[PDB]
Amino acid sequence: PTHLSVDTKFKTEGLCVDIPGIPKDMTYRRLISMMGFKMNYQVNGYPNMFITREEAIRHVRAWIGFDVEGCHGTNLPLQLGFSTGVNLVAVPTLMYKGLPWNVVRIKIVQMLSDTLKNLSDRVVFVLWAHGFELTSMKYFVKIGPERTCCLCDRRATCFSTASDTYACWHHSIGFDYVYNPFMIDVQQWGFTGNLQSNHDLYCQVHGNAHVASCDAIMTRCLAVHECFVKRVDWTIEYPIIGDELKINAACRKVQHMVVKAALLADKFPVLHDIGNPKAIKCVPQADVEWKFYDAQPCSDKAYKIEELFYSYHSDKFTDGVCLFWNCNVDRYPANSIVCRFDTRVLSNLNLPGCDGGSLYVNKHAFHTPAFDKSAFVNLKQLPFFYYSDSPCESHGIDYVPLKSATCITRCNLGGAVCRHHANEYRLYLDAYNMMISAGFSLWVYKQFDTYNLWNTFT
C-alpha cells in the first residue's frame, strides 16, 4: 500500500465526450496504454504515471493544474492551460499564439523548470480529466526508469532529444521533454457536477474567464480545498527547501522579545494565550498569570472572536493582554499582541491556496485564511525595536560601533552601545527581517510605547 496499483479501476464517464465509446471498465494499465505510453513490465522506481491522494498530498509543492481545451484532436489546435496562468496553443500542422508541438514542448519544460526548481524534485499534474489533456501528454512527456541528472545527484525531470541526456529542474535549459511526470485525476474522488460548480462552492477568488489556464487554476484550487481545507493532516512532514529553520528560530526570538517587552512596559497582571494547544510560555521568567486557550490553526475561515471568547478561563479577556501568535481571528480585541501570516507574500514556502488563502508549507502544511487588513482595526503595526536587560559583557566577527535609537539597553541609555549588545542587536535585526520577509506581520495594542522600557534600567 505505497503506490497506486496500475490494476486499480479508473472511472471513464468524464472522458466520454472527448473520447466517445470509451469502455466503462478501465484500469490505469489500459489508460496509460491508450495514452500512447508503454510501461514494458518495469520495476525501476516508476510503477504508475498516476498517484494516490496520499502521495499527492506529500508532494503538494509539485502540484501544477493542467487543462486542455479543443480550440477547434488530430486535425484541431489545442489550448494548453497551466495553474501558473500560462496558455499555449499547439497546432498539429497569458495567451500565446498557435505553434507546432516541437516548440510548445520546449516552452513547457522551461515553464515547469522555473516554477518548480526551488519547490520540488518532481511535477504532479492536477487534472479534472475530460480526455484531450491525457491524449496530449504523448507530445511532451517521455517515460522510463527513474534516472539521475547529468550535471548533479537530483532525480531527472526532463529529457533532451538533442543530446540524448537527462536533467533535473535546475539543469534543464534547452531540454524538450518532461521526463517521468506524475498526475492525479481529481474527477476520480467522487464528485457530482462539473469543475466550476464544485470549485465555486468554496472559492470566489478564481473566476472562469473561459480559458484553459482558468480551469487548471480551479482544478488545483479544488484539490487544495479537499486535501488541506476540509481535511487537515499535521502528521505529514515536508522536506527543508529554504530558510525554514532560520525563519522558525527567528519567530521564537521575536515572540519572546515582543511579549517580554509588552509585559515590562505595561505590567499586565494576566496574559490570555490563545492558539496552538501545544504552546509553551514564551517568557517563562515573567511574573504574569499565564492562561492558555486551545485553538488549532484555522485552515478555512478566520475564527470569529465571538465564538473564541463567548459562550461562558479568567472569562474576562478584557483584563490584561491577549496573545494571538498565528491564531487568525476576524477582529482582534484592542488589548492584543498579534502575529498574523500575510497570505499575499511571495516565497518558495507559501503556495497559492483556496478562496484568497494560501498554503504555507514549513515542516507541516498549513492552509491559512486570506489576509484581511480590517482584522487589525483596534491595533497598530508593531514597530521594530530590540530590548535587553542582560549585562554588558562581550565574552569570547569584527566591529563597527552601533548607533541606534531602537537599541533599548543600559549601555545605550548611558550614551554608548557596548559590543555584546551591538552584536545581539544586529543578530536580532537579521532574525526580525527574516520573519517579516517570510510573510509574518506584527501588531500591538495602541498604547504600546518602547519609551516605557527605558525605566526598567534603574
Ligand X SMILES: C[C@H](Oc1ccccc1F)C(=O)O
Which residues ranging from 213 to 232 are in contact with ligand X (CB under 6 A)? Answer: 217
- Bridge partners (DSSP) listed for residue 339: 325, 442
Say which entry of Zn ion, ligand X, none residue 411 contacts (CB below 5 to 8 A, set by partner kind).
Answer: Zn ion
Q: How far is CA 15 from the centre of its chain?
A: 31
CA angle 72, 98, 167 (to 5 degrees): 120
| Contact between residue 77 and residue 209 where contact means Cβ atoms under 8 Å apart | no
The one catalytic residue among 133, 176, 185, 355:
133
173 sits near ligand X (criterion: CB under 6 A): no
SS3 365: strand
Q: Toward ligand X, which CB reaches closer, 217 or 223?
A: 217
Spatial distance between the Cα atoms of 36 and 154, rounded to a whole number of angstroms: 27
| Contact between residue 306 and residue 236 where contact means Cβ atoms under 8 Å apart | no
Say which entry of ligand X, Zn ion, none residue 32 contacts (CB below 5 to 8 A, set by partner kind).
Answer: none
Spatial distance between the Cα atoms of 199 and 450, rounded to a whole number of angstroms: 47
Say which entry of Zn ion, ligand X, none residue 151 contacts (CB below 5 to 8 A, set by partner kind).
Answer: Zn ion
Query: Is residue 215 flagged as an active site residue?
Result: yes
Q: Toward ligand X, which CB reaches closer, 206 or 421?
A: 206
Q: Which conformational region is residue 297 in: left (phi greater than 0), alpha (psi within -120 to 50 degrees), or beta? A: beta
- Bridge partners (DSSP) listed for residue 365: 361
Q: Toward ligand X, which CB reaches closer, 205 or 236?
A: 205
273 is in an annotated binding site: yes
Work out which of 173, 205, 240, 416 binds ligand X, going by CB under 6 A. Answer: 205
Q: Toward ligand X, which CB reaches closer, 27 or 196?
A: 196
Binders of ligand X: how many residues, by CB under 6 A? 4
| Contact between residue 299 and residue 233 where contact means Cβ atoms under 8 Å apart | no
61 sits near ligand X (criterion: CB under 6 A): no
278 is in an annotated binding site: yes
Query: Is residue 200 flagged as an active site residue?
Result: no
Q: According to the 3-state scheme, what is the secondary structure of 226-295? A: HHHHHCCCCCCCCCCCCCHHHHHHHHHHHHHHHHHHHHHHHCCCEEEEEECCCCCCCCCCCCCEEEEEEC
Q: Toward Zn ion, which CB reaches closer, 149 or 338?
A: 149
Residue among 56, 21, 428 at smallest CA distance from 250: 428
List CB contacts of 302: < 8 A, sequence separation 6 or more.
328, 329, 330, 369, 372, 375
SS3 225: helix
Q: Toward ligand X, which CB reaches closer, 304 or 344?
A: 344
Q: Toward ligand X, which CB reaches closer, 151 or 205?
A: 205
Say which entry of Zn ion, ligand X, none residue 152 contacts (CB below 5 to 8 A, set by partner kind).
Answer: Zn ion
Work out which of 206, 260, 410, 420 binds ligand X, going by CB under 6 A. Answer: 206
Task: Tell me the residue type at 213.
Answer: S
277 is in an annotated binding site: yes
Task: Tell me the residue type at 171.
Answer: H
SS3 375: helix
352 sits near ligand X (criterion: CB under 6 A): yes
Quickly count: other Cβ atoms within 10 Å of residue 43's Cβ.
7
Say which entry of Zn ion, ligand X, none residue 352 contacts (CB below 5 to 8 A, set by partner kind).
Answer: ligand X
247 is in an annotated binding site: no
C-beta of 358: minimal distance to ligand X in Å? 8
C-beta of 419: minimal distance to Zn ion in Å? 8
Residues in contact with Zn ion by the rule CB under 5 A: 149, 151-152, 154, 168, 170-171, 203, 206, 221, 392, 409, 411, 418, 421
203 sits near ligand X (criterion: CB under 6 A): no
369 sits near ligand X (criterion: CB under 6 A): no
Q: Which residue is nearest to ligand X (CB)?
A: 352
210 is in an annotated binding site: yes
| Contact between residue 151 and residue 119 where contact means Cβ atoms under 8 Å apart | no
Query: Is residue 424 flagged as an active site residue?
Result: no
Positions marked catalytic: 67, 69, 133, 210, 215
Residues of each annotated binding site for Zn(2+)? 149, 152, 168, 171, 199, 203, 206, 221, 392, 411, 418, 421
Residues of each annotated binding site for Mg(2+)? 67, 69, 133, 210, 215
Binding site for ligand X (CB under 6 A): 205-206, 217, 352
